[PDB]
Amino acid sequence: MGIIAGIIKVIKSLIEQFTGK
Amino acid sequence: MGIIAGIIKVIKSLIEQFTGK
Amino acid sequence: MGIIAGIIKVIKSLIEQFTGK
Amino acid sequence: MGIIAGIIKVIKSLIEQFTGK
Amino acid sequence: MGIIAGIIKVIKSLIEQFTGK
Amino acid sequence: MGIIAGIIKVIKSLIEQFTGK
Amino acid sequence: MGIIAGIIKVIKSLIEQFTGK
Amino acid sequence: MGIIAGIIKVIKSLIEQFTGK
Amino acid sequence: MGIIAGIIKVIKSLIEQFTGK
Amino acid sequence: MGIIAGIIKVIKSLIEQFTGK
Amino acid sequence: MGIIAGIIKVIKSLIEQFTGK
Amino acid sequence: MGIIAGIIKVIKSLIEQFTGK
Amino acid sequence: MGIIAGIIKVIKSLIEQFTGK
Amino acid sequence: MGIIAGIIKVIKSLIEQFTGK
Amino acid sequence: MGIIAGIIKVIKSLIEQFTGK
Amino acid sequence: MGIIAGIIKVIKSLIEQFTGK
Amino acid sequence: MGIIAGIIKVIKSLIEQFTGK
Amino acid sequence: MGIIAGIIKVIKSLIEQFTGK
Amino acid sequence: MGIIAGIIKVIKSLIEQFTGK
Amino acid sequence: MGIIAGIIKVIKSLIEQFTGK
Amino acid sequence: MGIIAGIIKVIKSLIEQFTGK
Amino acid sequence: MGIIAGIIKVIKSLIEQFTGK
Amino acid sequence: MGIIAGIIKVIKSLIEQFTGK
Amino acid sequence: MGIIAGIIKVIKSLIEQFTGK
Amino acid sequence: MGIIAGIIKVIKSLIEQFTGK
Amino acid sequence: MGIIAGIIKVIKSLIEQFTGK
Amino acid sequence: MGIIAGIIKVIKSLIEQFTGK
Amino acid sequence: MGIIAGIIKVIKSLIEQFTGK
Amino acid sequence: MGIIAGIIKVIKSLIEQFTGK
Amino acid sequence: MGIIAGIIKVIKSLIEQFTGK
Amino acid sequence: MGIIAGIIKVIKSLIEQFTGK
Amino acid sequence: MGIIAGIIKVIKSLIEQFTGK
Amino acid sequence: MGIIAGIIKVIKSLIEQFTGK
Amino acid sequence: MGIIAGIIKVIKSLIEQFTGK
Amino acid sequence: MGIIAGIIKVIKSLIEQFTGK
Amino acid sequence: MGIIAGIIKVIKSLIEQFTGK
Amino acid sequence: MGIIAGIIKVIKSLIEQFTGK
Amino acid sequence: MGIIAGIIKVIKSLIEQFTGK
Amino acid sequence: MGIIAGIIKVIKSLIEQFTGK
Amino acid sequence: MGIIAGIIKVIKSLIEQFTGK
Amino acid sequence: MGIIAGIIKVIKSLIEQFTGK
Amino acid sequence: MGIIAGIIKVIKSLIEQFTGK
Amino acid sequence: MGIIAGIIKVIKSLIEQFTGK
Amino acid sequence: MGIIAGIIKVIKSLIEQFTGK
Amino acid sequence: MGIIAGIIKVIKSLIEQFTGK
Amino acid sequence: MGIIAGIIKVIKSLIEQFTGK
Amino acid sequence: MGIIAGIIKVIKSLIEQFTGK
Amino acid sequence: MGIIAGIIKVIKSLIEQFTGK
Amino acid sequence: MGIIAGIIKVIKSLIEQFTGK
Amino acid sequence: MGIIAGIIKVIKSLIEQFTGK
Amino acid sequence: MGIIAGIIKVIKSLIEQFTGK
Amino acid sequence: MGIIAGIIKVIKSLIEQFTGK
Amino acid sequence: MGIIAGIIKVIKSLIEQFTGK
Amino acid sequence: MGIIAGIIKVIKSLIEQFTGK
Amino acid sequence: MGIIAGIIKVIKSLIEQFTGK
Amino acid sequence: MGIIAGIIKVIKSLIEQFTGK
Amino acid sequence: MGIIAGIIKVIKSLIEQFTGK
Amino acid sequence: MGIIAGIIKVIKSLIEQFTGK
Amino acid sequence: MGIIAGIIKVIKSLIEQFTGK
Amino acid sequence: MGIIAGIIKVIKSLIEQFTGK
Amino acid sequence: MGIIAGIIKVIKSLIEQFTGK
Amino acid sequence: MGIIAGIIKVIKSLIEQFTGK
Amino acid sequence: MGIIAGIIKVIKSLIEQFTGK
Amino acid sequence: MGIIAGIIKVIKSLIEQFTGK
Question: Kind and range of the H or E element at AO18?
Fold first, then answer.
């Protein structure tokens, strides 16, 4: 179902994706 | 389903995508 | 389904795409 | 479905695209 | 479906494209 | 479908294109 | 479908093109 | 379909082209 | 389809071209 | 299809061309 | 069901994806 | 059901994914 | 049911996934 | 039911997954 | 029922998974 | 019922899993 | 009922699993 | 009822499992 | 009822399992 | 009732299991 | 009732099991 | 009632089992 | 009532089992 | 009542079992 | 009442069983 | 009442059983 | 009352059983 | 009352049983 | 009252049984 | 009262039984 | 009162039984 | 009162029984 | 040859021994 | 040859021993 | 040869021993 | 040769031992 | 040779031992 | 040779031991 | 040689041991 | 040689042990 | 040599052990 | 040599162990 | 040598262990 | 040598272990 | 050497372990 | 050496483990 | 050495593990 | 050495693991 | 060494893992 | 060493992993 | 070392991973 | 070392990953 | 080390990844 | 190290990625 | 390291990416 | 490192990207 | 590092991008 | 780094981009 | 870095862009 | 960096742009 | 950097633009 | 930087623009 | 920077513009 | 910067404009 994959360097964040409702 | 992948360097953020509703 | 991928350096943001409704 | 990819440096923003409705 | 890609430096913005309805 | 790509430096803006309806 | 690409420096704007209806 | 590309410096504007209807 | 390209410096404007109907 | 290109400095304007109907 | 996998270096964060409700 | 797998180096964090409700 | 597996090096953390309620 | 398996090197941590309620 | 199995080297930790309530 | 099995080298720890209540 | 089995080398520890209440 | 079995080399320890109350 | 069986080499220890109360 | 059986080599120890109260 | 049986080589020890109270 | 039986080689020891009170 | 039986080679010892009080 | 029976080779010892009080 | 029977080879010993008080 | 019977080869010994007080 | 019977070969000994007080 | 009976070969000994006081 | 009976071959001995006081 | 009876071959001995005081 | 009876072959001896005081 | 009766072959002896004082 | 000797209190009896044929 | 000796209280009996044929 | 000796209280009996043929 | 001796209370019986043929 | 001795209470019986042929 | 000795309460029986042939 | 000794309550039986042939 | 000893309550049986041939 | 000892309640049985051939 | 000892309740059985050949 | 000991309730069985050949 | 011990309830069975050949 | 111990309820079976050859 | 221990309910089976050859 | 322990419900099976050769 | 432990419900199977050769 | 543990429901199978050669 | 653990429902299979050679 | 764990439903398969050679 | 974990439904397959050589 | 995890439905396949050589 | 995770439906395939050599 | 994740439906293929050499 | 993710429907193909050498 | 993501329908192809050397 | 993303329908092709050397 | 994105239908082609060297 | 995006239908081609050297 | 975008139908071509050197 | 965009139908061509050197 | 845009139908050509040097 | 745009039908040509040097 949900995936995140790579070189991930996120800082001090908020991050969203919706698929569905 | 949902993916994010690369060199990701997001800071102090809000980020959205919708697909669906 | 939803993807973001590259060198991503977004700051102090809001970002949207719709496909669907 | 939805993609953003490159060198992305967006700041203090709002950004939209619609395809569909 | 929807894409944005390059050197993107947008600031203090609103941005739209429609294709579809 | 929808694309924007280059050196993009838009500020304090509103921007639209329609193709379709 | 819809494209914008170059050195884009638009400010305090409204911009439209129609093709279709 | 629709394109704008160059050195674009438009300010305080409204801009249109129709092709189609 | 529709294009604008050059050094564009339009201000306080309205601009139209029709081809088609 | 429709083009405008040069050094464009139009102000406080209305501008039209028809080709077609 | 839910997955995260790569070289993950997230710091001082909040991160979300929804698929479903 | 729920999985995380890779080289995981997360620090000082909060991390979430929902699938379901 | 619930799994975590790889080279896991998480430090000073909080980490969550929900699937179900 | 619940599993963790790999090379696990977690330090100074808190770690959770829910599946169920 | 509950399992942990691999090369496990956890230090100075707290670790949880729930399945059920 | 409850199992742990592998090469287990845990040090200076606390470790939990719940299944049930 | 309760089992632990492998090469077990735990040191200076506390370790728990619950199944039941 | 309760079992432990393998090559067991635990040192300087405390170890628990509950099943039941 | 209660069993321990294998090659058991425990040293300088405390070890517990409960099943029942 | 209570059993221990194998190759048992425990040294400098304390060892417990409860089943019952 | 109470049993111990195998090759037993315990040294410098204390060893307990309870079943009952 | 109480039994011990095998090849028993215990040295420099203390050994207990309770069943009953 | 009380039994010990096998090849018994205990040395320099103390050994106990209780069943009853 | 009390029994010991086998090949018994105990040396330099103390040995006890209680059943009763 | 009290019995000992087998091949008994005890040396340099003390040996006890109680049943009763 | 009291019995000892077998092949008995005890040497340099002390041996006791109590049943009664 | 008191009995000893078998092949008895005791040497350099002391031997006791009590039943009664 | 008191009995000893078998093949008795005791040497260099002391031997006792009490029943009564 | 007192009895000894069998093949008796005792040598260099002392032998006692008490029943009574 | 006192009896000894069998094949008696005692040598170089002392032998006693008490019943009474 | 006192009896001895059988095949008696005692040599180089001392032999006693008491019943009474 | 006092009796001895059988095949008696005693040699080089001393022999006693007391009953009475 | 034949002997009976002791305190003999036989009643309402038949008694036999054979030695010879 | 044949002997019986002790406190003999046999009643309502038949009793035999053979030695010889 | 044949002996019986003790406190003998046999009733309503038949009793045999053979040694020889 | 043949002996029986103790407190003997046999009733309604048949009893045998053979040694020899 | 053959012996039986103790508190013997056998009833309604048959009993045998062979040693020899 | 053959012995039986204890508290013997055998009823309605057959009982054997062989040693020899 | 052959022995049985304890509290023996065997009923309606057959019982054997061989040692030898 | 052969022994049985304890609280023995065998019923309606056959029982064997061999040692030797 | 051969032993059985405990609380033995075997019924309607056959039972064997071999040691030797 | 061979032993069985405990609370033994075997029914309608056959049971074997070999050690040796 | 061979042992079985516990609460044994085997029914309608065959059971074997070999050690040796 | 060989042992079985616990609560054993085997039915309609065959069971083996080898150690040795 | 060989052991089985627990709550054992095996039915209609064959079961083996080898250690050795 | 070889062990099996738990709640064992195997049916209509064959089961093996080798360690050694 | 070899162990199996848990709630084991295997049916109509063959099962193997090797460690060694 | 070799272990299997859990809730095991394998049917109509073959199962292997090697470690070693 | 080798382990399998969980809820295992394998059917009509072959299964292998190697570690070592 | 080798582990498999979860809800395992494999059918009509072959499955391998190597680590080592 | 090697692990597989989850809800595993593989059918009619071959599956491999190598790590090492 | 090697892991596979999720909802795995592979059919009629071959699957590989190498890490190492 | 190597992982695969998700909803995996691969059919009639070959699949590889290398990392390392 | 190597990962694949999602909804994977690959058929009749060959698939590779290299990272490293 | 290497990842593939999404809805993957590749058929009759060859697919490569290199990063590294 | 390397990623592919989306709705991927590639057929009868060869596909490459290099980054690095 | 390297990414491809969208609706990808490539057929009978060769495709390359270089970044780096 | 390298990206391709959209609706991609390339056939019978060769395609390149360089950035770098 | 490098991107291609749209509706791409290239056939029988060669295509290049350089940026850099 | 480099982009191509639109409805692209190039055939039997060679195409270049340089920016840089 | 470099862009081409529209309805592109180039055939049997060579095409260049330089900007830079 | 460099752009071409419209309905482009160039055939059998060479085409250049320079801006810069 | 450089642009060409319209309905372009150039054949068998060479075409240049310079702006700059 | 440089533009050409219209219905362009140039054949077998050379074409230049300079602005700048």
Answer: strand AO18-20
The verdict on a CB contact (< 8 Å) between AN3 and Z5 is: yes
Rounded distance between C-alpha atoms, residue AF18 and residue AE20, angstroms: 8
- Compute CA distances AY8 → L4, AA8, AQ17, AW10, BC7, whole Å: 17, 68, 37, 10, 20
Q: Nearest CA to CA, how far is AH20 from chain AE (Å)?
A: 15
Residue count of chain G? 21
Q: Mind telling me how many Å the CA of O12 is from chain M's nearest CA?
A: 10
Q: Is B5 in contact with BD6 (Cβ distance < 8 A)?
A: no
What single string gives the DSSP state of each residue in R1-21?
-----SEE--BS-----EEE-
Please give the method by which this entry was determined.
cryo-EM
SS (H, E, C) BD1-21: CCCCCCEECCECCCCCCEEEC
Instruction: Give the minimum alpha-carbon distance from H11 to chain J in angstroms, rounded to a whole number.
Output: 10
What is the rounded radius of gyration, in angstroms, for the C-alpha atoms of chain U? 11
Q: What is the DSSP letter of AQ11?
A: B
Backbone phi, psi, residue AD8, to 5°: -105, 120
Q: Which of BI3, AR20, AK5, A10 is nearest to AS21 (CA)?
A: AR20
Distances from the Cα of AX10 to the Cα of T7, AL1, AW13, AW14, angstroms: 35, 68, 7, 9
Mind giving me the DSSP string for BB2-21? ----SEE--BS-----EEE-
Rounded to whole angstroms, how far apart are CA atoms AN8 and AN12? 13
Query: Under 8 Å CB-to-CB from N1, ≥6 apart: which residues?
Result: M1, M2, O1, O2, O3, O19, P19, Q19, AW6, AW7, AX7
Alpha helices in BJ1-21 (DSSP H): none
Q: Among residues 1-21 of chain AO, which lie with CB inside 8 Å of chain AM?
A: 1-2, 5
Using CA atoms, how far residue W18 sits from X16, Z21, AZ3, in Å, is 9, 17, 48
Q: Report d(CA AZ3, CA N3) in Å as an integer.
A: 12
Which chain E residues are closer than 8 Å to G1 by Cβ?
A: 19
Chain U residues touching T16 at Cβ < 8 A: 16-18
Q: Distance between CA atoms of AS13 and U18, rounded to whole angstroms? A: 32
| C-alpha–C-alpha distance, residues AN14 and AO15, integer Å | 7
> Contact AS6/AT4 with Cβ under 8 angstroms?
yes
Which of C2, C7, C21 is nearest residue B2 as measured by Cβ atoms?
C2
Cβ I5 vs Cβ G17: under 8 Å: no
At G17, list the tokens: 């093109």
Residues of K in Cβ contact (< 8 Å) with B2: 17-19
CA angle at residue BG18 from BG14 to BH3, to 5 degrees? 80
DSSP annotation of AO19 reads E
Are AH19 and AG20 in contact, with CB atoms under 8 Å apart?
Answer: no
Q: H helices of chain BA, where? A: none
